[PDB]
Amino acid sequence: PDLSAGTLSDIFGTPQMREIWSDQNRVACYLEIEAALAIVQADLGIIPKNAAHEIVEHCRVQEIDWALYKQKTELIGYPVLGIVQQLVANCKDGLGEYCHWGATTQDITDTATVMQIRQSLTLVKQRLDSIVSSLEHLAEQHRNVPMAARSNLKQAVPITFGFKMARFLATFRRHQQRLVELEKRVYTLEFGGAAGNLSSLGDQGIATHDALAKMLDLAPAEIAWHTEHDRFAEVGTFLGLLTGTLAKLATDIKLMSQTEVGEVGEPFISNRGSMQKNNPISCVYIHACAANVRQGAAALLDAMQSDHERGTGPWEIIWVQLPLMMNWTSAALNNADFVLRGLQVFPDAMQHNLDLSKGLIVSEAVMMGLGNTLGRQYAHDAVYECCRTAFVQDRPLLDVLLENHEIASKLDRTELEKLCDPANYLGQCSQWIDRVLSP
């Protein structure tokens, strides 16, 4: 088990995920399943015990002739019996004729794919843990930094940057719970034979299935699921849900990185953004990866139409989309991880953007305050008419408020500036942040 990369293979993928879904790890998973099967069937008394040992001793990927395997896969049409043929030829005294006993190739591919998935989700759980940790730090560190919230790409009312990070944090917490829920279904053995009923094992296939299952630390199956692809498809839809949030994160960050906005920046790495333009390339890659995974999810839903006891086409969609969606997702997870660990935050630009409306962004605040001293009704009417006068003449809301003599007589400039200061109107952002950090 040792170590193939093109120009972009580590841009839209990761080295780790590529290895999990490599031909070598796949065939290794195959050989692990075959070895465990032999051992299981030996204890049960189905196959000789000396044969099991010899099989296990040749269940090693390093002994695989790859060019021969490729050719035999293309001729046979499926990717297992080529490995079986070599396993049989590698065993001495014909003891290889006891491997693959009662198994069909989709038993090996489905169970391999579950093993590869479990390895894959270990990396995703790690990426998620780190992303969550960064968001926890970011929510606290930036708990009290004011900025303009945006609705339909227009300024709404002030919030804090840590508030925005708390909302991402709550989402990734949900994704984590979704992940652990699907694991109990997905981490399941597939061993049913040609038709799912293990006809060639007699009264023994279900003892074999139950023993093979926890030999490989997998849940026993209720019943065969060769054309019941809901375990594989829900992994795909989870990847779609997770990358969706990654894509929102990328959208918000690249939007806050605009020359005209300048409120955040990806972590500085010398000459990475390609004067000094630092393009949000991590956001760029996340976006493209999310787009490809969401369509790959639709392909895996499509794949669930596998007919009868082996799909004539739909099953084979999983061979292609699953590795790709894993690799794309890991690239997006890697990039968001990197961005959130060293994210630059520019409070002075957030402050400058808050001051663009010259107090109109806190029109409500002024109203609320002036209410007790002027009257709910006059407060509404006066602020609304003052806010609209400031809009047409490009003036501070304060300056127009001060031309209302009843307002000027009731409040001194100093009180009115605190009402006209966007930084004084954050509602309960910090208490909301606290509610997310609390668990």
Next chain:
Amino acid sequence: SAGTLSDIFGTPQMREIWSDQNRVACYLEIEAALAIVQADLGIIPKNAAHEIVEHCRVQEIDWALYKQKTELIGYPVLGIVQQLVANCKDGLGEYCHWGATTQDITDTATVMQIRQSLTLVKQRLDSIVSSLEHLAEQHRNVPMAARSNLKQAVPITFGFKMARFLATFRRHQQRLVELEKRVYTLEFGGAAGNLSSLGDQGIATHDALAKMLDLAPAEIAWHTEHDRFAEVGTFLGLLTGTLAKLATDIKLMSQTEVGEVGEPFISNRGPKNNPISCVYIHACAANVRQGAAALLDAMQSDHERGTGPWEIIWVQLPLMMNWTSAALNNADFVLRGLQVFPDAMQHNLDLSKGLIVSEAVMMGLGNTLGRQYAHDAVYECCRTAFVQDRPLLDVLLENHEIASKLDRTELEKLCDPANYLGQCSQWIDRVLSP
């Protein structure tokens, strides 16, 4: 309702849940509950709460004016708020929609609509599971040919095939209850999610509003965090994918040349028997899987209100609920009255004249000759049986060692497809045991 296909690719129950009238009805329950909460906590006068709840009535809406207002405003709530304020007397409606924003209403109405919609789905699923529970038992020992790559494989039972659908639909039930924790959640955060205008009362209004509607309180605002809605969509995709397989298998078994099952007999629904339910299931599943991709796409809502992605949900979630209901409805109907033809399954088992159970002949003959040597020898007789279109039994008897070790009475039984059923019944037991 009146459209020709409105009940073919939809259903009346689901269509009314997502109708303009039930949506505005959900809006009005929310605004009334909000006024009750804010009166009890002292934010608005209690005479306004009473006046507002009594005018939170869908019957009072001028729909033509509402529509014209929504097309002007751009979003679907403040048109209802405008009618609620004008309907109140001396100006007590000025205290409705107090500190809320339109998406608080649309999001939370959609949760309520989703909960109504999932009650129907849960209800259809229950019916489908028991139909499969009885079918698995009823046809437990009905032999038939399993098929791989649309070629005959080895014999199974029709109940075994039904137990596999049964296990699958149960997992979908588990996924339904699982997402319900996340989805049944209040959305109340205001313009930017922090309830700025409610001051130190914003969180209290949210929390007490939540239990007013029997909804979980949200960790934090989720106006552009659409993973609850998108997750429902991908569940409908997963569900309609299994319905699509069922429709695929039934319509394949409904072929003139196969004739092993048939959709329930109705009148002149097809001398015919067209699998039109399978047809509708298929078209529904295809549209749902694509809509699910649209819902993932919609998760990219920017900042605190999406500039486009959010609106994708306004269109896709009703369609996908309606499409799924139509597909669940048809699968419920077909499974409840499914016709099963054991004589056709038997005729198809005999097509190969024994080759479909060459594996059984190998096993039985392995005891006296050896697993490896019997495998090769029987495979060599399968050479002669197929090329000369003979029964395998006849060719097996022309081999010396096989005839010398096994007699004709015993070869006819290894060559009977009805005897090579494996442990099918134990597998239906394992699925029917829980």
Next chain:
Amino acid sequence: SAGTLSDIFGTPQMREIWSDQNRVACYLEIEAALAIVQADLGIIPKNAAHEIVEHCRVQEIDWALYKQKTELIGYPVLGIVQQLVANCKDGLGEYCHWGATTQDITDTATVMQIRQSLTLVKQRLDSIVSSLEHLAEQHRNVPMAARSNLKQAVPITFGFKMARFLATFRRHQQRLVELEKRVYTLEFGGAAGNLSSLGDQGIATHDALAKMLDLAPAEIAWHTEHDRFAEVGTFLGLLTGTLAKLATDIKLMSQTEVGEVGEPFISNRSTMPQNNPISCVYIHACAANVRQGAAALLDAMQSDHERGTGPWEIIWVQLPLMMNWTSAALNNADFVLRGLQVFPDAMQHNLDLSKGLIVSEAVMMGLGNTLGRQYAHDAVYECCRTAFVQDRPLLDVLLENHEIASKLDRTELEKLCDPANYLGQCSQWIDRVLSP
């Protein structure tokens, strides 16, 4: 219709084309043409063709009865056929539908509906094109900052940016004309495509029916060959793709911090002092639904044998939605482009954000002769990076290099640092799209 959002994610003209009523109107138009065609050829009695045509009128259909019958029969034609026979006198009912199968009518109806729909699309495209031709010429010399990866790149003009949309919509117009001559095609082949019940009159009927309906005669039956319908789907995907970009760029220029364009001013079009880009919002959501719709229609192409068992029916649902969603997007884009507010002052303000850094490239070339092309590069590069860290004009830092200050005077220098002086051949490129 009358739904709150039915004219927001759709339009009246498109809803009508795909309405049950216009669909059935198409059905009866086809059945009347068929009876007449078969009277001329002698297949049916001329008294039958006359009586049938007199009753091919959408006003006479029992809509509730047609609905229940379609739900029982399973397909949407024989319910209308049954009422046509009951409405004719002296049993003249079916000499109609003579040798036709239901999908002959649906397919041919859908083709007439697509032609009506594409009549709308070609009109909106013509208006969009004219607005863009006007905007490209109007704002031919309006400088603004181009943007790459959402960061400013080098100056362009706003009319140059509109010319690039214009060139795109012209390509979409060509695509539309190209597919029309494939799509406007008759479907008349009967149950299995060979019109076996018409004997030696099948091709004769088909070719006469095609001329009657102003459609091309089919090479052969295409009941399970959905490429004509699917390529309409993919064209709606392509076209809405461009509309979606237009929506993305306009809403991006509408941000509070950018403010370079705005949707046409209308009333309270959502209250807080102010106007959200809802046209952009609707275009985006319609594009998203159309592009997935085109994938379902590619999926539909897998209709088995001589009538698909599911794939065909996907078209019943997807095609009308995609036509309606697209018309909603085209209406909004038409509206936005006809009265688009453009703010050259905000464009100039954003050009001046970097205080000359945006045209550092021009400073290098301009300083090349007096310094040396490579000292110019190295010196402007380092002066630019000092100018950013201190938030000062590039000019001022350039004048703090004594070698530079000795070679050129300040007049020459904030001509080269003036972003408006570095616009390239934007105007000549605009011309190429207008075609002078």
Next chain:
Amino acid sequence: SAGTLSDIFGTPQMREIWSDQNRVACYLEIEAALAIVQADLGIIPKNAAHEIVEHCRVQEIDWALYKQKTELIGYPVLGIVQQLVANCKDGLGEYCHWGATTQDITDTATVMQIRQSLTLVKQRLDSIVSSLEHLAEQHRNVPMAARSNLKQAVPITFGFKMARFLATFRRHQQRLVELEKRVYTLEFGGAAGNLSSLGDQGIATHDALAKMLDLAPAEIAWHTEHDRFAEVGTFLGLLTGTLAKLATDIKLMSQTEVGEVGEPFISNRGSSMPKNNPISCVYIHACAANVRQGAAALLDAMQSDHERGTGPWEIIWVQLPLMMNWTSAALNNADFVLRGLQVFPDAMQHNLDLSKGLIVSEAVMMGLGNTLGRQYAHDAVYECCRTAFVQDRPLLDVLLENHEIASKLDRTELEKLCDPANYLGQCSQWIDRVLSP
């Protein structure tokens, strides 16, 4: 370099067009053509052009360093440009990439790659079309049961069925020819489309470079205007849809219970049980499904913002090579199957006779229409079909027991009306209509 499935869901020829090496080779041909154009226009010195063209060779690329620079820079051109400058002598490499931005190179190379890919696709289509012309003629008179909703309908001929594919593939050929004139277009516009750095020589450079590369000059820059690439994607979706139908039909006709066709015989190509397996059909199906979702991602990619997209443009980097490779494998399999398709007329005949004459009840109604009434014969034959099907008896036998039927038509005449081989309509005329251009 090839993995286990690299030639199963892909092809060597297409994998090679989209490889790193062919892509970088296109980059270098464009850089060479650029220096040659600008040397003639006097924009760069001719000695530099000669030195730049001499080093525009893929063989001189350090691939590991190119990877490292691309991961750092973010985009895949300037790593090749860096090596081209350094490989040139006397600092003459500073005149390459003159006025270009990376997307000019990636877009134009992608165009060159697409043209090479459509050369393969056109060769596959010609072969598929030729195979179908032969099959439509050879099986012009082979009768079989047509199928609607997977139920037998009325009789047709297998050559009629193949003529229907043939007409479809000719329409795809027309679509390909139509998009090529739009797609085969130069991209050369600089950072923002206006070639600001080239001044009054930008348009002059663009048009000379275009004809140097045998590409149409562009109306205007199209860096974020991806309709040419998305159009290629949707065409692949249309084409693989037809291939997917062909695969669905052939695999349905390959069922154990149907047995009407079979994929070409290759010793042990079907995993086996003495058994075959429609593996070619299996692969076409999965390829069409992946191509069709990619078409959606290419449409999604059209939302590139302003003058260089922040994300959407990069979708094309991944989707286009994959969709092309997937399509090439579907075309490879479809070409192979159609060249050696096995047709079993005896099975088609056996399946026709299953209904015992019901499949041609329509023909009996017409025949008996003349002497009894077109409407009356229909209802009368239709009532007879109930007894034949409820009793599992031949339609002929029940017809001979209907008294006015037997009075008006003899056995010998009802033989012919009940023979499914006599109700084929104008299948041969329709085949002729397709084969005739």
